[PDB]
Design an enzyme around this catalytic site. Structure first.
Site, short mmCIF file in Angstrom:
data_model
loop_
_atom_site.label_atom_id
_atom_site.label_comp_id
_atom_site.label_asym_id
_atom_site.label_seq_id
_atom_site.Cartn_x
_atom_site.Cartn_y
_atom_site.Cartn_z
N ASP A 111 0.84 -1.15 0.00
CA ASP A 111 0.00 0.00 0.00
C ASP A 111 0.89 1.22 0.00
O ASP A 111 1.71 1.37 0.89
CB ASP A 111 -0.81 -0.04 1.27
N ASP A 113 0.98 3.99 1.10
CA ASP A 113 0.99 4.88 2.27
C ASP A 113 -0.29 4.86 3.08
O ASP A 113 -1.37 4.53 2.57
CB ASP A 113 1.30 6.32 1.85
#
EC number: 3.1.3.3
Length: 323
Positions: A111, A113
């Protein structure tokens, strides 16, 4: 040039020599060892604090280096007392059962962030676009449970209508990549793994990252851009918790990778579905609630900590010689 720098995985005799010889044992089988400790610099002093608190002498089967990290394959079992003292010392640790095999075809999905760092990103695009407040009024309405996740996104984006494209660059540059992402990418590619990112940010950013780092796949929310202005619409699907898990399973099949040889790195409740679907979920600097659900967590190290974990299965099963 960033994804040309791997994390060297090598045995150093100097690292061993840092510790008394008594700290090591050779009786226990590496292949049965269950956990590792790792950090930028391991010292006898830290292990004596660990020993004191756990009321036992914690022996090491083997130590090696992964980039700037030093990893120790540990005797015995990770108890909750171990976790407490390791957190105090700010050393990472992990159980290595079910850790995928770097020498077999594999996939990692990350992911881009924390949803918190993506709220900041969008709030900054909004502030630059001059609609900082409209977007705020909308984030508030989402806090009241009035708007679900997708509505909030789509509605916040809609406030950007007519914003000039170059606002996206101007924001890209005020932001830093996850620490050690480039190394993680290069290292995994060296082993022939595929690397995919899936975030709730914008295709503009994730596609740039995909360019700089030669990621194999990237999927985010695509901002419609016409005549160099944002139209305020989001093209296609809004990436959700479920979307992430779907990307992982699709690519696995597409890349011909066994599910058990996949890895998912996440930090928020948003990633738990992806993490539950992968062979191994790794919480990266996540909330204690998300840490407690993930099979492994990196707390102190950069993304190189992910390679420390994967290197352990390599070394435990003696999948390769060093030089």
């Amino acid at each position: 040039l960033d994804a040309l720098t791997t994390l060297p995985i090598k045995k150093h005799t100097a690292l061993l020599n840092r510790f008394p010889e008594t700290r090591f044992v050779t009786q226990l089988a590496k292949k049965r060892a269950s956990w590792i400790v790792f950090g930028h610099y391991l010292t006898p002093a830290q292990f004596e604090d660990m020993d004191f608190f756990t009321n036992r002498f914690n022996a090491i089967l083997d130590m090696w280096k992964v980039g700037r990290y030093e990893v120790a394959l540990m005797d015995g079992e990770l108890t909750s007392e171990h976790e407490t003292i390791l957190k105090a010392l700010e050393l990472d640790y992990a159980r290595i059962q079910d850790v995928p095999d770097l020498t077999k075809p594999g996939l990692i999905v990350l992911d881009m962030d924390s949803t918190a760092i993506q709220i900041e990103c969008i709030d900054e695009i909004a502030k630059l676009a001059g609609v900082g407040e409209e977007v705020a009024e909308v984030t508030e309405r989402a806090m009241q449970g009035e708007l679900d996740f997708e509505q909030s996104l789509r509605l916040r984006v809609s406030k950007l209508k007519d914003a000039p494209e170059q606002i996206l660059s101007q924001v890209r540059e005020t932001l830093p990549l996850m620490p050690e992402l480039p190394e993680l990418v290069a290292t995994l590619h060296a082993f022939g793994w595929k690397v995919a990112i899936a975030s709730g940010g914008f295709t503009y950013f994730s596609d740039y990252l995909k360019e700089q780092l030669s990621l194999d796949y990237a999927q985010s929310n695509t901002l419609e851009i016409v005549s160099g202005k944002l139209t305020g619409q989001v093209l296609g699907e809004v990436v959700s918790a479920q979307t992430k898990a779907d990307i992982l399973l699709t690519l696995a099949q597409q890349y011909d990778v066994e599910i058990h040889n996949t890895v998912a790195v996440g930090d928020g409740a948003n990633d738990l579905v992806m993490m539950a679907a992968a062979g191994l979920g790794v919480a990266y600097h996540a909330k204690p609630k998300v840490e407690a659900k993930a099979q492994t967590a990196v707390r102190f190290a950069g993304l190189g900590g992910v390679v420390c974990i994967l290197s352990a299965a390599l070394v435990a099963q003696q999948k390769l010689s060093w030089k």
